[PDB]
């Protein structure tokens, strides 16, 4: 079994709208394609003993024994590897269950689709499923160590990409509130929201956290000084720069019950909490002395250690922290008591459970010795011994919710502290014997203000009720009543996407907003080019969505991007589907028109229920998508009498139709005329029906999304694709009642491009200037026959500058074809496209149209000037 190609999808896609995270593996069953289980002796017992958990897979026998009941009845391998990849991820804790298989290409090549949680772990599991499955169809078993090592690699891959718990907490609430989020490439930041409404977070810091407040909170002297100047209670203390001045500091502080901290910070290290004697002052000093050089000799205050969380100048949560400890739970020793309580089902590992394990070490002993105890001593009933100097959940301590027990005056004081320092999200470290009484009555103090505090102790307390800490954070970032998203208008369909996209962006721009858009030519913001080249697909959509200045996004969406990686945006306000056609069938595993319709319908199905889908009522496959759409539906057509439109407006729907020479909007019984087709420059004087259809789609999308008609009129009137602005695409020459249209053609589609004007031209003569260059195979006679059946003024120029085919031989085949079908069309032969055939247009009578397909458009559009065009 060989893997030929792998795709990773991230967003709504062909296989599923909801299953955003999928891996599509193109698997070549060189062997096995001819062996449906029962042709592979041992491929049941080996499969079930290696992966016994496969008994939990249903498959289409929609019952518990379905897989493993369809494995006896013969099954081809490309279907099994899909149940192995899903299970290998489940075995390591990543839940995935969706999957599908389809045969493609030549016999034996399958598309295996499965769900993933982590992107690299998913791809790994796929490759591993193939190895496991191949060994079991070669031999009858799979080495245990070759399974255990793979499960270890999956466990590590899924760990390395995990978000920390404070970010998971914010992100989870953001999803509940429908706020989109993205990881950014730098500094582990996460973006919340789109365009101008975006916010950024990094763990517990946000886009609203100021630098001055954060730096002040990290400066212990600065914090103490600024708070005592504000009348806020702080501990009494002084400074010694590693000199033996300890004997003096103690006297200013007020006595021996003192605290000695390291002069610089190193987390919870080098700290002595309750010095009672001179020799202890010395030992404390020696530890403080380990760090770099007024946090020396503070008065010791009695009470419990409380953590207060304040989010936007408002209190959110309070918890009491207690150090790891044991109590005199009968006449047992401390080491016995520890084993008894360290078996509690709520303890173990880390972020796996509420509490972690109590560990006896030299530091537990050092703490116990100061209390008059050691590990082999028996405690008096209900006596408590601490095994740690400080409280921390990660070291085996506990956290008790006390949020509702805090006195109103203390609430006021904590909020004032956060505002004085200047922090939005702040943790405040308070020492007090009773949080339910004012700090002035209990002689409590504020020990420290902490920027970027963690949330674990408040969202997962060991006693008391959990608090939703994230909700107050998202409320400051995205206040009630404000948006987190900008409008997205997504345009798809087989033909006309680029034209519709540029017009729609132009109309929005007339409202004065910053409009970003992507197309097959470039990425633009307000007429500045950001990037050039084919910029369709999710990588470009992300440039616009992450851009802090963009107010509206207009995105052309191609099948390439959908089939290769899904959509970049999840949902949108307007989804426009212009048409479905048999163009690019056979590519990307889409062989039929019915399948192509499912690729295009992805846009219609991601429109938000409050939004609209804009469908083409003149297209049988597109109109039919209306029955899948959860959104409102608007329709457009070139025929006001289309039964779909009539049934729709009679139920007060909205539609855009071409009628009486006007582009108009039908809104129930009322008709709003926008403009005349002949007065809108993109429309070739009113003789190019597809340009009219594209204008209708853009006008309707702007209308249903709330733009006024006057704005729409201004936008359609001033929009351009002028000759020598966008040369090379349909350059029309109006020379009074004389016409010429210059475009490029190679194959029949290019000739058709102007053949459409010819069919609709309201005049007397229909001519043409050549057609193919030397870029075509010997279909010159056929192209000549086509011209004969279209035109009655056909002039030959097939002797170009490139000369890939000698000289005039190209023309000679055209001449045979044109004379064969219609030997009476002014068949002059010039063989000069630089100074003659694109000049000699005076050979064609009044109201004559000449179709021009030069090898070089830029040149032809200049020579045609000899006849004085507009």
């Amino acid at each position: 079994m060989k893997i030929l190609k792998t795709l990773t999808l991230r967003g709504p896609n062909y296989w599923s709208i909801r299953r955003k995270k999928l891996i599509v593996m193109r698997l070549d069953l060189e062997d096995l394609a001819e062996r449906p289980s029962n042709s592979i002796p041992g491929f049941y017992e080996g499969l079930i003993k290696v992966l016994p958990s496969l008994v939990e897979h249903f498959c289409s026998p929609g019952y518990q024994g379905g897989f493993l009941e369809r494995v006896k009845e013969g099954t081809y391998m490309g279907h099994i590897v899909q149940h192995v990849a899903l299970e290998l991820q489940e075995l390591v804790g990543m839940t995935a269950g969706f999957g599908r298989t389809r045969e493609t290409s030549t016999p034996g090549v399958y598309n295996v689709v499965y769900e993933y949680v982590d992107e690299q772990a998913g791809r790994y599991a796929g490759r591993a499923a193939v190895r496991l499955c191949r060994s079991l169809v070669d031999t009858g078993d799979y080495p245990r160590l070759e399974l255990e090592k793979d499960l270890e690699d999956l466990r590590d891959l899924g760990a390395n990409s995990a978000l920390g718990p404070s970010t998971e907490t914010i992100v989870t609430e953001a999803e509940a509130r429908k706020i989109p989020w993205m990881l950014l490439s730098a500094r582990a930041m996460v973006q919340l929201g789109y365009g101008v409404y975006q916010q950024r977070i990094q763990a517990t810091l946000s886009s609203h956290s100021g630098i001055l407040g954060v730096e002040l909170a990290c400066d212990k002297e600065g914090t103490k000084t600024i708070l005592q100047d504000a009348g806020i209670p702080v501990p009494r203390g002084t400074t010694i720069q590693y000199f033996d001045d300890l004997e003096e500091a103690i006297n200013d502080v007020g006595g021996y019950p003192v605290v000695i901290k390291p002069l610089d910070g190193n987390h919870g290290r080098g700290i002595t909490i309750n010095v009672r004697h001179w020799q202890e002052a010395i030992a404390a000093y020696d530890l403080a002395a380990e760090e770099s050089k007024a946090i020396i000799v503070e008065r010791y205050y009695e009470g419990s250690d409380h953590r207060v969380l304040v989010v936007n100048g408002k209190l959110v949560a309070v918890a009491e922290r207690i150090p790891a400890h044991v109590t005199g739970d009968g006449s047992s020793t401390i080491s016995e008591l520890i084993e008894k309580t360290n078996q509690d089902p709520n303890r173990g590992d880390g972020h796996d459970n509420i509490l972690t394990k109590i560990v006896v070490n030299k530091t537990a002993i050092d703490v116990m010795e100061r209390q008059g105890y050691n590990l082999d001593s028996v405690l008096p009933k209900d006596e408590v011994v601490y095994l740690r100097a400080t409280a921390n959940l990660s070291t085996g301590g506990i956290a008790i919710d006390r949020t509702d027990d805090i006195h109103p005056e203390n609430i006021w004081l904590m909020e004032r502290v956060a505002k004085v320092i200047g922090l939005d999200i702040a943790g405040i470290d308070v020492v007090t014997s009773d949080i339910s009484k004012p700090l002035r009555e209990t002689n409590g103090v504020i020990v420290e203000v902490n920027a970027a505090p963690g949330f674990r102790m408040h969202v997962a307390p060991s006693q008391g009720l959990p608090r939703n800490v994230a909700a107050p954070v998202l409320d400051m970032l995205f206040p009630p009543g404000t948006p987190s998203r900008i409008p997205i208008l997504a345009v798809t369909g087989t033909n006309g996407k680029t034209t519709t996209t540029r017009l729609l962006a132009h109309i929005y721009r007339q409202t004065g907003k910053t409009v970003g858009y992507t197309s097959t030519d470039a990425i633009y913001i307000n007429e500045y080019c950001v990037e050039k080249g084919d910029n369709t697909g999710p990588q470009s959509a992300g440039v616009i969505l992450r851009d802090p200045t963009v107010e509206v996004a207009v995105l052309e969406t191609a099948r390439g991007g959908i089939l290769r990686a899904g959509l970049a945006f999840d949902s949108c306000d307007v989804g426009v589907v212009l048409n479905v056609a048999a163009d690019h069938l056979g590519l990307g595993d889409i062989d039929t028109i019915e399948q192509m319709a499912k690729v295009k319908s992805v846009i219609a199905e991601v429109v938000d229920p409050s939004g609209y889908a804009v469908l083409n009522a003149d297209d049988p496959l597109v109109a039919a998508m209306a029955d899948k759409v959860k959104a409102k539906v608007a329709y457009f057509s070139m025929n006001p009498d289309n039964p779909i439109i009539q049934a729709h407006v009679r139920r007060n729907g909205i539609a855009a139709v071409y009628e009486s020479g006007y582009l108009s909007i039908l809104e129930g019984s009322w008709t709003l005329r926008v403009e005349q087709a002949k007065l809108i420059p993109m429309t070739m004087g009113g003789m190019a029906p597809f340009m009219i259809a594209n204008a209708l789609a853009a006008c309707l999308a702007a209308f249903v999304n709330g733009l006024d008609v006057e704005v729409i009129r201004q936008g359609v009137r001033t929009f351009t694709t002028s000759a020598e602005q966008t040369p090379g695409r349909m350059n029309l020459f109006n020379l009074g009642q004389h016409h010429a249209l210059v475009d490029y053609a190679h194959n029949p589609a290019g000739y058709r491009a102007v053949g459409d004007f010819v069919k609709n031209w309201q005049g007397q003569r229909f001519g043409v200037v050549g057609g193919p260059g030397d870029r075509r195979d010997s279909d010159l006679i056929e192209l000549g026959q086509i011209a004969a059946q279209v035109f009655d003024r056909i002039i030959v120029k097939e002797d170009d500058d490139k000369r890939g085919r000698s000289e005039g031989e190209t023309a000679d085949l055209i001449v045979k074809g044109i004379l064969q079908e219609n030997p009476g069309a002014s068949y002059e032969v010039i063989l000069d496209e630089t100074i003659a055939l694109n000049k000699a247009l005076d050979q064609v009578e009044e109201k004559g149209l000449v179709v021009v397909f030069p090898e070089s458009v830029t040149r032809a559009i200049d020579l045609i000037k000899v006849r004085n065009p507009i």
Binding site: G164, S166, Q202, A203, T204, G427, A451, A452, P453, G454
Partner: peptide, 4 residues
């Protein structure tokens, strides 16, 4: 930290 990141998580004070």
């Amino acid at each position: 930290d990141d998580d004070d």
